[PDB]
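Let us walk through a complete example step by step. Step one is to write down the protein sequence. Step two is to encode the small molecule, magnesium ion, as a SMILES string so that its atoms and bonds are unambiguous. Step three, shown after the inputs, is the structure prediction itself.
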Amino acid sequence: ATKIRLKRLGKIRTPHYRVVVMDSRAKRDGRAIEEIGQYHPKADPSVIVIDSERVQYWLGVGAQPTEAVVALLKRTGDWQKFTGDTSPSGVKPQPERPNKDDLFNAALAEADEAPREAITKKSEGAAA
Amino acid sequence: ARYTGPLTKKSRRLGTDLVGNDKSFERRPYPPGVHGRGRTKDSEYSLQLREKQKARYAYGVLEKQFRRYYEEADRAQGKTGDVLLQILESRLDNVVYRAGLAATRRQARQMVSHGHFLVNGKKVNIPSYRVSTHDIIDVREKSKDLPPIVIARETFETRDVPAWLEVRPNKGRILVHQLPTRDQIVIDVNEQAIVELYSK
Amino acid sequence: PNIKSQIKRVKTNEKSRQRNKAVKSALRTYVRNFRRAAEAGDVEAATKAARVANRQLDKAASKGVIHKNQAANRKSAISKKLNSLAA
Amino acid sequence: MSENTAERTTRRKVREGLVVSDKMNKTITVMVEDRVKHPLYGKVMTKSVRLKAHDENNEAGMGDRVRIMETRPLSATKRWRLVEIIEKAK
RNA sequence: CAUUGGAGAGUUUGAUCCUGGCUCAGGACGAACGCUGGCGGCGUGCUUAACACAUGCAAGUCGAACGGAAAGGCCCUUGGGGUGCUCGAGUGGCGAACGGGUGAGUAACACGUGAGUAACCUGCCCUUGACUUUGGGAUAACUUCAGGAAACUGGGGCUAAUACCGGAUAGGAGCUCCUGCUGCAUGGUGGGGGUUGGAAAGUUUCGGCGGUUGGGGAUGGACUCGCGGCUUAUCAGCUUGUUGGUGGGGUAGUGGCUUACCAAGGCUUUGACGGGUAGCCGGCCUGAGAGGGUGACCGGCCACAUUGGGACUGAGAUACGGCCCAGACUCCUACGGGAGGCAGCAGUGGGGAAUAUUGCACAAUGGGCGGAAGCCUGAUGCAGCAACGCCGC
RNA sequence: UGGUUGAUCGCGUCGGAAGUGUAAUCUUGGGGCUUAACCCUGAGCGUGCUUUCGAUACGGGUUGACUUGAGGAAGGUAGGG
Ligand SMILES: [Mg+2]
Ligand SMILES: [Mg+2]
Ligand SMILES: [Mg+2]
Ligand SMILES: [Mg+2]
Ligand SMILES: [Mg+2]
Ligand SMILES: [Mg+2]
Ligand SMILES: [Mg+2]
Ligand SMILES: [Mg+2]
Ligand SMILES: [Mg+2]
Ligand SMILES: [Mg+2]
Ligand SMILES: [Mg+2]
Ligand SMILES: [Mg+2]
Ligand SMILES: [Mg+2]
Ligand SMILES: [Mg+2]
Ligand SMILES: [Mg+2]
Ligand SMILES: [Mg+2]
Ligand SMILES: [Mg+2]
Ligand SMILES: [Mg+2]
Ligand SMILES: [Mg+2]
Ligand SMILES: [Mg+2]
Ligand SMILES: [Mg+2]
Ligand SMILES: [Mg+2]
Ligand SMILES: [Mg+2]
Ligand SMILES: [Mg+2]
Ligand SMILES: [Mg+2]
Ligand SMILES: [Mg+2]
Ligand SMILES: [Mg+2]
Ligand SMILES: [Mg+2]
Ligand SMILES: [Mg+2]
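Step three: the predicted structure of the complex.
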């Protein structure tokens, strides 16, 4: 049977899965009919990208998802669009956001307490 | 995996001051050893190799890693010597040295490998950490009162900080304005000679 | 065999072989009967034998002893021979 | 009336060649020539291959320039069929 | 309407220039050896004997198909209730053709690439149209008897099914006749008529889960074909089912695939036939490039599973942990006869310059069966070992 | 392998379009492992092939001219061919 499953990639102790479509008989990390998405669980709020159109097409043509892919489709909302069920459909929370340029401009100007806690550490060496 | 032997011997052999001044380099015009005062032929290889070794012993980088730097610079677009010197200057220990928080690059390597420094919030103990633009190197809060740190705080005014770095001495904070350019790295080797050497 | 599944399998393979061989031999006998009727040139006997043989071919195809394509091929041969005999 | 996806599209392979053997029944051996670059020296060579076609009615003779279309295996070696005769050199 | 890229040196002479070979500086490795040896990260680790293998494990699962009750578990004066969960052995379904291994064979439509099947088959899965009718006979288990050292074998009796077999009813299955539109020759396809025919299974803890048959989808496989990639002419002739034709047979399917008859073809100095070597490729190394070398890990295809041959079962078979026969081996034997195949994982012997632990876990991903809980998984995830490689300290 | 030239075909050749060239590798842009090796991700590459639509300068095919290459006729002619 055609399956929608996870193809493991990455390093030792660092898995990244490719949500792919292949038949059951094929080996886990092998040729796939189509690559649908990716799933990085090692990362914070695991990354879950699923191509909605393609996954809907494959579900409608009769590909059988593995339980993991069912969980991912529940989170992406595709498991509700196909086989309509009352599920929370918790579209992935974003894994927050850092920045660099704003912090650099903030500190370049920070000055003040930069050299200020700096002469405070001067007083510290005094204490040292 | 680190040169721990004397540096004045290497400076005398290479003919230039690898670091510091006003020292045993008063015996400069001749390399170390019994056969130092003799006249030399100096082939092209000799010359090239001298430039490469000067850069290596100046920056505290061994041959495999220096070679890796060379292929990275060669692949990069622009002048190969410019990119190579830019990489070597972007090394974190050299960044600490140039900012002036360390007396020498060896001291900078010591403190960096011992972890007295924070890179934009994250602790780094890798001397070869390539600092990127707009980065913020910080002294570890526990180690803001190191004796070498206070010596640097006493002496930095004499030291010249390059234009591509901003330093809050008393605060221990090195802001990286931009990744330096050849006109900003001090000219003390022949990067062109090094590039020619790595082609034979 | 080394696996009890495989021992079960050799037993069931023998059983299925007996069944399939019996059905195929019956098919061959029916087709031979039709061929001998056709060679004898009779019309009613050949017609009856052809009906019997085609029905048995379809029955075997349903039972899975032979493929439906094989059943269709043999039925087509029998029907064409009977048509030639009638003509 | 309303037939299925018509056209079939799927077109078969066509070769123009010269008949080099007509002395077996319902079969003509066609020599098809193609011009390709040499892989190393770049010269445009001439590659020739003998193709056995099926000529119902034996309508083609030696030296005739013919057109053949690929087919299903018609014998141990025949895989083409004559579709027209372009020049009857005779 | 610019480039990302190209280094030499020594040596023939008394000396010179040229030609010219030899040698060296570079990079690389599935490497080995010598000396030496701190750590971590990520990889890699029998290239030789496709040599012979002790031992454990590597494929099972389903009681919601069935008779049942040998264990555990509940209820009962120890047996007894099959009574409920559960459950060996047995029937039955599915899986066992995948995953994993190796590279011996193969110079070939095997592989790469691109097409064709109007010559194809496709279990489970999805979708849609019809249905799920009426009977019957056995048998394993069990029981008894006989034989055998064993492997086990043969009788008597007895028993249930979604096991097996009559029948009815069902198209797009056979044959045939009209007619519409058409292709690439054989033709494809729409509509109607005649005629002969082809199925099924029940079960449940009522929440389920299933059965048969048309048509599509998806998936996987099969065959055919153009082009492409070794060496040898100190191999020049090769072939007689061979090349083509017609009828029959066979097959999922075209076909000398097979057969009968007829014809005399087919291939070849543009290298047939023969010899040598070799799994092929994505890639890897090197190189300014063009090329040259290579085919470890990983991924795709192929081939093979003690050697040779054969079929069986099945939707599907080179059937690794299947069967049959033969050969060579090993083992058991009461001498009558039996049993077996690490190129699965770990491991041993052996060969070799040389390559590891008889480890842990199914927690993750993948697979098999089950309605499910779940069971199985030497796939895999991991750990051990070795400076073998890369990187960092 | 091919002198000059008309016409035509569009096989070579050239230019678009579609399909294909799995993934990994590789080049490169981002991101993650404290850095790196390594890993993930976007793109390129995949140097070809098939299908299809154009162009006709050149090569070639088909076809027709021209005489300068080539050969022949007539006359002249040298020679131990
Ligand atoms: Mg008989
Ligand atoms: Mg037939
Ligand atoms: Mg000489
Ligand atoms: Mg000399
Ligand atoms: Mg049981
Ligand atoms: Mg395999
Ligand atoms: Mg291999
Ligand atoms: Mg049945
Ligand atoms: Mg070939
Ligand atoms: Mg025939
Ligand atoms: Mg071999
Ligand atoms: Mg090769
Ligand atoms: Mg492999
Ligand atoms: Mg079968
Ligand atoms: Mg097996
Ligand atoms: Mg297998
Ligand atoms: Mg085995
Ligand atoms: Mg082993
Ligand atoms: Mg040895
Ligand atoms: Mg699982
Ligand atoms: Mg479960
Ligand atoms: Mg087990
Ligand atoms: Mg010309
Ligand atoms: Mg012209
Ligand atoms: Mg990539
Ligand atoms: Mg980073
Ligand atoms: Mg690719
Ligand atoms: Mg022309
Ligand atoms: Mg004359």
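Step four is interpretation. Residues 65, 68, 75, 92, 115, 119, 122-130 of chain B lie near RNA strand F (CB under 10 Å from a C1').
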